[PDB]
Nucleic acid binder design. Sequence first.
RNA 1: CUCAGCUUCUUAGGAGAAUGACGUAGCAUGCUACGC
RNA 2: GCGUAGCAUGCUACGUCAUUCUCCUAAGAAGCUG
Lengths: 73, 927, 187, 187
Amino acid sequence: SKMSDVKCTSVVLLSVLQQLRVESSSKLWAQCVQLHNDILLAKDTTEAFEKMVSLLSVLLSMQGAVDINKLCE
Amino acid sequence: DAQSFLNRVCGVSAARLTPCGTGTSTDVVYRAFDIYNDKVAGFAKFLKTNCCRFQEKDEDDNLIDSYFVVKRHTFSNYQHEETIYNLLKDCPAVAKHDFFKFRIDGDMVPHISRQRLTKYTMADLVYALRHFDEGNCDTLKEILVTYNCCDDDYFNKKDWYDFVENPDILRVYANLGERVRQALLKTVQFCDAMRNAGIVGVLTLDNQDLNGNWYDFGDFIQTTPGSGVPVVDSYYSLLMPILTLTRALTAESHVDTDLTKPYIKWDLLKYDFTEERLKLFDRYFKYWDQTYHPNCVNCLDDRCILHCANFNVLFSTVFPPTSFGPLVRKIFVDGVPFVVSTGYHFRELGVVHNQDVNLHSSRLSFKELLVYAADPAMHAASGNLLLDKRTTCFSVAALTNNVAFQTVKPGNFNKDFYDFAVSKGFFKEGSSVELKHFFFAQDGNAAISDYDYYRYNLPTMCDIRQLLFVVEVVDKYFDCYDGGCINANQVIVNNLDKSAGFPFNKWGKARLYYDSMSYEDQDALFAYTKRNVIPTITQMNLKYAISAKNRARTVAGVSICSTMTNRQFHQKLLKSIAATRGATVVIGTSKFYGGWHNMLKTVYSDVENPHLMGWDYPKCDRAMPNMLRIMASLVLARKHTTCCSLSHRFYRLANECAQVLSEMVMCGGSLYVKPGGTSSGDATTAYANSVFNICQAVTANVNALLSTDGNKIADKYVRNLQHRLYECLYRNRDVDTDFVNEFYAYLRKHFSMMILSDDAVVCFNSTYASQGLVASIKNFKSVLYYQNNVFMSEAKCWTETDLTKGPHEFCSQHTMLVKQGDDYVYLPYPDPSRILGAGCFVDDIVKTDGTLMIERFVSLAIDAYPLTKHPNQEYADVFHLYLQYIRKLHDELTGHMLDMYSVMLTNDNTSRYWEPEFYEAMYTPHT
Amino acid sequence: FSSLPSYAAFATAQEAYEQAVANGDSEVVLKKLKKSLNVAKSEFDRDAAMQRKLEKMADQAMTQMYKQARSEDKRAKVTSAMQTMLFTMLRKLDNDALNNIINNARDGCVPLNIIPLTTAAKLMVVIPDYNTYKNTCDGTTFTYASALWEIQQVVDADSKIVQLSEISMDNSPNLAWPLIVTALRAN
Amino acid sequence: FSSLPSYAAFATAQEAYEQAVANGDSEVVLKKLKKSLNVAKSEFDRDAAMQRKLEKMADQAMTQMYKQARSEDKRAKVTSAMQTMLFTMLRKLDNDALNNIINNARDGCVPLNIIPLTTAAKLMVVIPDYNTYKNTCDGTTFTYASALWEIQQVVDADSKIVQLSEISMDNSPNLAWPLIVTALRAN
RNA sequence: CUCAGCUUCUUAGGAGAAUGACGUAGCAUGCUACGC
RNA sequence: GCGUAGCAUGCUACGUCAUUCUCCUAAGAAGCUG
Ligand SMILES: N#C[C@@]1(c2ccc3c(N)ncnn23)O[C@H](COP(=O)(O)OP(=O)(O)OP(=O)(O)O)[C@@H](O)[C@H]1O
Ligand SMILES: [Mg+2]
Ligand SMILES: [Zn+2]
Ligand SMILES: [Zn+2]
């Protein structure tokens, strides 16, 4: 069940980004939404995980928006 | 004998010819024909074996597109054609005939050699663009290639024929425009020639070579000079849709009509193009006998508005797009000058002028303020110009100062439900049930993109002598219901807390405008709209809904001054449609309580060899032609035979077209102009789409019945039905009520229909459809191609064969024959992916909890119950999932309530929701 | 509810029944007292029904009156708001240019679409991609609607001002399209 | 609901009824006890209807208060709930690329742009300390997001392009962190 | 953040039907007192 | 044998309380379909 667990993590990740006010960046939001829609439309799994990596990199690009240390513990 | 005959054929013209015949023998080929004689009728494709055809060669030994045809016929027709040609010689729009006699064995056989023709007559072009089949369209590829309209390899593209995939096909067709315009001019010249020469005869499409030169004079009876009667009802009417598919009149936009010279600069202040419309009509459709009123305001009935509007939808593609839309005027109200709309200039209905214009008014009551604040004159005249290059639709003004970009949220997630599902063996790797319906997010400019999707709506001219009969047949499908104008106090509006378009949404919901106006004023506004046009600003909103594809559906919220009066106009008929059972339009018939088995067994109404079919229109509202929506609004407004006069009904039609068809769409802080197509937010949308769908189906039936040969119909009732249908279309100007009823009975007995907006299920007779005596999937693809301008792929068409399984899909709900109470009934089950998506992905964040949203999983399980007997087990466990999850929700709710506030809930009413009996009671015919 | 004349009669009958029951166990006294109590109970129930009906009717009337008063207040408020909007947009349109274009109209009616096209002193061109900027409104002055417009501001999709020199094909991706460029009417 | 005073009557009269049915004294006593039991039953029935209606009202009030409170709590606590859910799902996903990128970003090795997925494209990733540089970077190769990237120009915090040979073991303290390494995919 | 249809659930109100209980009026029958 | 009152049984009408059920007006939460 490793595939259909990425199509949901991408939904949750884009919801998280949309709460960090990434909508303001009209190009960053376009890239995020394109990655989201491409993950949700992903027959394969390697492509889904690569686009998930890119979207998570968008999330981690923000310096202090999300405290990775407090959460990964 | 070959050279002696060929040498004679290549006479004084001094031409070099290659013979296509074997030994100077007749050539047999497939060719379209608009034939109507004592035996057969119909615009079909026949064999032609009466002529021997040679092809000319230019210099360098290359076959030029010019043919010497040689008809062979008895002495009588030869002598009757010699006179009629020598009497039409001086006309320049007539192929240069050449008459002679030849000896074969021992007797003379006259030959009528038509010279310098072309391979494909006009009928072939019309048929190819009119009866289009993807599998075998070789009379269209050859026509396009041989006339420089594209390259021989342009047809290697993925979808070279799809108006939706590649909109470049429009340009390839438009490259044929000049040839069609020259054909129109040459047929006008020929009609004038035969009128001045006193020849009376029928003009058929299949006699005009694609250049334009008419070449057949067989049945041309002669009379005194100056008394010719060219019958052009079956020519100018079969050539209608091709006249705007190929934009034949584009070359009328240039000075002196020359293509090379620049566009004619129409002065922007001009709005009354009546003189230009009349001049164009008298230049091209000179001998179209029926009267043409450029402004439909002075038409005669519902069947003259269609005719005049069908001509205007072609004569308005020459005039600038910046002269249509409302006409404004400065009215002084107590010394302050407004700029209010005092008319309209429709693309179809010509110029409409208000009858109640009162300059120098003193008081503005609530009704007048409502009318003025809705008109786009003030809004788009006080706004600053705007040139939006994100779309192709016209742009009027920018009400705000800077554009507003609206995004779409990605849709929340229901973690506990997904964990429960995954625990219960769901969403494994490679399972029959999987998540496929998601909440898709969109970037900033989604709304403008989905408005720009209107570029698929092209100005479509509809074959008028066929539409004026399809309208009667479609009307017979609506004769059961009753309706009329209702007073303001009989109006039923479901909920009054839904927004009121623009600009009325800036001060309250629809409740404010429905409760703040007394009934007398609410009826005075309607009586006013019945005497003048009030333009309105629609506002296009985005829809936040779960879907399997990532298009951002936009819904056209219409202003209150439009819906509030369309309701008074249409509510009676709409409720009559929604309350009638056993009719074609299944609206208001629930799928529960055995309401779907009733639908299916009403569809299977004694059709001898049923074979279900179904079609979904792609972009039903963004590609529906203006003419079809005008006709649909006419059909729903024909119940008003007593309440409203003729002019009242026309002004109601004008208001509907001003507020729905071609309006000012406020797509995100800017006023664009819709090219056309229905706004799916008005009162008559699910019922005005039903009329359009029935019109398309009936037109497919008419085309399929006519396009048959005629001698190959063994049944002698259907042959006569075809022979009478053709003459009722193109040889009758008044309604033939008895035959309309006969053909409606034929359709009901062989083409039983179940229509619901754009979702249709036909149960057509299999053998007739095989023989072409009724429609089929190809006979509907062609109709959509040449009337909707959308090629309907096989992804949106289905054709079942075993009636037991029922329709493949109707309203997204598949059907299955199942055992229930000792009898077999059809239960509708959804796509399990849709139910699981509605469970996992939810619109709001408060709904994610579930523990306080148990009245949602009950309503999902109600729709998901039928799956509980699907043969597959993963399909059938998506209902036990919901039952067990509802049980879990109830347990958790009881625990949480006990913890927070010690109150054990009263059970014995909440235990029904996790037992199948309650849900199984929802699909039994007791209620 | 100790109200209405019926309750007084009911109380008197109940007291008489209670007093006479001890004095008379059965027979004429008990029968008469029971009949009196029964008729008093019937009358009291009748009066209670009449009350619970008239009071309900009065409450429904009062709530209807409140609803009507609030409806009239909202009617007045929305009428004032619409009138103020009309007088704001009526005092904003270009009276000079608009009156000039209307004056030279034949019947006095001019199509709406040519009111802003020829009398609006501003143009908000939305550009989706750079090529469109290059081929439609290049430079600090362009020409639209047969009028010479001069640029005054070029904001991006983030509503952040973008300088004219910043826009170039090399530096096109770094921007946030579409670009909303506002231009005035330079005669 | 046998917890209200009326029920007591239901007992007493009923008790008497019991004593009557065994006794069977006469039909007049039977009628008297039937009347008493009927009046007591009507009183208890009215009381029980009132009690059940009041209990239903109280249950509705409780189940409205609970729903409102839970909705308010869930709406207010959504900024952090979403992130906790996201990282729970990511750590349960157990993918090498996501795990490696998250672990690197844990200790300040965040990327300055979206990690590209094409054949070769720019990626600027910061490096706080020499330990991370040793862990992921080596010569011209860079190991981030489980893919080899070609080091091009390690840019110091002062925008001073530092030669790779400078960064080695105990020479780091002289150089002022944090570096900004650029890299391109090497597939 | 539109038009229309359908369905589930909760409360308020109105009408009707059935059952139980109380009360008033009227009628059929049985018995004691006063009457003839 | 008949009448008045009283008691007992039965029936008709009317007025209340309660339970259940059906339908219909309205308000609220929710789902699905075009
Ligand atoms: N009535 C109605 C409507 C419709 C749909 C959704 C709504 C709505 N929320 N309000 C009002 N109307 N409405 O139904 C038609 C068809 O809907 P379908 O979902 O099949 O969409 P297409 O066929 O356009 O798209 P494709 O088939 O390419 O996926 C529309 O055009 C419109 O008129
Ligand atoms: Mg469709
Ligand atoms: Zn007319
Ligand atoms: Zn009417």
